[PDB]
Amino acid sequence: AMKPAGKTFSNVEIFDPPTNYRDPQVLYARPLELSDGTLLGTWENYSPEPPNVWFPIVKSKDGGKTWKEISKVKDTQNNWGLRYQPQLYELPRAFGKYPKGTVLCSGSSIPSDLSETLIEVYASRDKGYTWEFVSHVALGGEALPNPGLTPVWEPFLMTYKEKLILYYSDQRDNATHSQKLVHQTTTDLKKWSKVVDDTKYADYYARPGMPTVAKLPNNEYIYVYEYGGGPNPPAGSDYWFPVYYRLSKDPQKFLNKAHHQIVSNDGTTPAGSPYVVWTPYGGKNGTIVVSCGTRSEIFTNQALGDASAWKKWDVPQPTAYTRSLLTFQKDPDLLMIMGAGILPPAGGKNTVSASVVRLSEVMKS
Numbered sequence: 001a002m003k004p005a006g007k008t009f010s011n012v013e014i015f016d017p018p019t020n021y022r023d024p025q026v027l028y029a030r031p032l033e034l035s036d037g038t039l040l041g042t043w044e045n046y047s048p049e050p051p052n053v054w055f056p057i058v059k060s061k062d063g064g065k066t067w068k069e070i071s072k073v074k075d076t077q078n079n080w081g082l083r084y085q086p087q088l089y090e091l092p093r094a095f096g097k098y099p100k101g102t103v104l105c106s107g108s109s110i111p112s113d114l115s116e117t118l119i120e121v122y123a124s125r126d127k128g129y130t131w132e133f134v135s136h137v138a139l140g141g142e143a144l145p146n147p148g149l150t151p152v153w154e155p156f157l158m159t160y161k162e163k164l165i166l167y168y169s170d171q172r173d174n175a176t177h178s179q180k181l182v183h184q185t186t187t188d189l190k191k192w193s194k195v196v197d198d199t200k201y202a203d204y205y206a207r208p209g210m211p212t213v214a215k216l217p218n219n220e221y222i223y224v225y226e227y228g229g230g231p232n233p234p235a236g237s238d239y240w241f242p243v244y245y246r247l248s249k250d251p252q253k254f255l256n257k258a259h260h261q262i263v264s265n266d267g268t269t270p271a272g273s274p275y276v277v278w279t280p281y282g283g284k285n286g287t288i289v290v291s292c293g294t295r296s297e298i299f300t301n302q303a304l305g306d307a308s309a310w311k312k313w314d315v316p317q318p319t320a321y322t323r324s325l326l327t328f329q330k331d332p333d334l335l336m337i338m339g340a341g342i343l344p345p346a347g348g349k350n351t352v353s354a355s356v357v358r359l360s361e362v363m364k365s
Contacts, residue, residue, distance in 0.1 A: 007063060007334060008356050010316040014041060014058060014067050014338075015352040022046040024346035029338045031064075031326045031354070032088035035101060039064055039326075040128045042073070042086045042105065043340040043352050049112055052081035055105060057128050063328070064336055064354050073105045073122050073131045082120070083110040084143065089157040095164050096188030103128050106137075106155040106166065114143035117151040119168060121189065134189055140172050147178040147205055154210050160251050162187055167198065167211040176200075179207045181225060183252070198223065198254045199246070205229055207241075210322065213251060214278040217286055221251040222305050224276040224290060230261070234269075243270045243292050247305050262290060262299055264312040270295055273322035281332040281359045289335065289359075291323045298325075298337070300363065313362045317355040333360050 017025040028044040039060040047053055055073040060066060075082045086107035093100050103124040108117050117140035122131045141150035153169040163185045170182045173195070181199035184192040199208045207228030214222050226241040233240040246257040262270050273293030280286045288301040296319045303309035317323070320339025328334040335357050341350030359365075 007331070008358050008361070009065060010355045011318075011353055012064060012355065013351055013353050015043070015056070017046070017350065019348070020048055022048065023348070024341065024344040025348065025350045026340040026352050027343070027350065028085055028322050029320070029340035029352055029354075030086055030088050030324050031336055031338045032090060032103070033326055033329055034090055034103070034127055035329075036127070037063075037330065038127060039336075040088055040103065041067065041338065041352070041354075042088055044084060044086065049081065052079065053083050055082045055086045055107060057105075059128060063334075064356055071124075071129055071131065073107075075109050075120075076133050077120070077136070078109050078111075078118065080109045080111045080116075080118075082107050084108040084117075085154045087155050087157060091164075092159050095186065096190060098123055098134070098189055101127075104134070104157060105131065106157060108143075108153065108155070110143050116141060117143050117153065119152050119155050119166070121166075123189075135192070137166055137184060137192055138168065138170070138195075140170070145179075145207065148174065150174065156211050156213065158213050158251065163252075164189065165251065166192075167213065169209040169211070170195065176204070177206065178204050179209060179228075181208045181211055181254075185252070196252065199225065199259075200255070201227070201229065203229055209241075210273050212274065212276045214276045214288065216278055216288070216304050217280075217284075218304055220247050220249055220304065222247055222276060222278070222288055223251070223254045223257075224274050226272055226274055227259075227261075241272045243272070243274045243290065245276075245305065260305070260307045262310050263307075264299060264310045266312065268295070268297070268312055270299055275322060275324045277325045277327050279327040279332045279335065279359065281327075282363070286332075287359065287363075289325055289327070291325055291337065293319070293321045293323060295319055298335075298362070311363075315355065315357050315362060317353070333358050335359055335362075
């Protein structure tokens with residue numbers, strides 16, 4: 001007798017960090033699917049230094065079932081390390097001397113003392129085996145989320161027409177706001193535009209942050225973030241980070257758009273470190289899928305972001321800080337959910353893991 005006769009799985013471990021890693025050891029998991037179906041993954045790797053911290057790159061050939069480390073993205077520029085908030089992205093077209101299919105890794109280079117912040121772009125021309133420094137995007141100050149400091153954070157990349165847009169969180173322009181959501185554009189991955197405001201709130205202590213974006217089938221885009229200092233903090237809190245979003249045909253123009261809090265039909269209010277994707281699954285409008293960093297459920301919207309149409313569904317992947325999502329190019333029904341655990345103090349227990357669910361199963365088609 002031999003094994004009998006798939007694609008879904010739960011709580012597959014990716015990395016279990018050494019005991020001597022620094023709290024929280026790992027955090028901020030990100031996945032990427034390449035055009036050839038290979039998956040890459042990275043995270044914040046709190047290794048004892050030196051060497052200067054790096055972003056590991058793991059690779060899966062079997063839809064996330066098994067993984068192997070194939071490289072590291074190292075800081076070749078600053079003698080700091082690549083420390084916070086990595087983000088992987090595959091170019092869907094050419095920008096300057098970087099062709100379609102080039103893999104970008106963005107994130108923040110930071111000295112161990114957290115004294116400065118610097119959002120970089122690195123690129124791999126061999127589907128993630130080797131890396132080269134591309135450009136310095138945004139230099140900021142001290143890497144603490146305190147009012148008055150001037151750090152930059154949390155890069156997210158997306159292409160719009162002839163432009164590559166890098167969205168982030170920015171504390172530098174702080175005469176009025178302690179933190180704003182902003183972006184810059186490039187057409188060649190070398191020269192970046194002036195910084196443009198995406199979202200800002202008329203309270204100094206508000207901290208809108210952690211942008212992610214997805215394209216909808218009506219040619220609108222959904223812009224998702226956490227609204228630190230958002231209204232109506234729950235009993236026993238003076239400050240929280242409810243998940244909000246905006247809709248726009250032009251993803252360079254979120255500032256002038258009305259905001260919306262995600263609240264599910266049962267009154268559930270997701271908060272913290274959100275992540276959005278859109279999949280063709282679910283019919284006419286597909287499905288917008290959102291994760292937050294404080295709940296285990298997925299939040300969905302099959303009405304192109306109609307504030308009244310958010311639903312919630314249990315999945316087997318645990319709650320994680322900036323738990324991320326990926327929708328499979330060969331199969332829209334398949335959703336990967338990836339995390340690297342909880343915020344410090346994490347009690348020495350964080351690991352990197354993922355599950356892949358079928359939406360037709362999760363969401364009772």
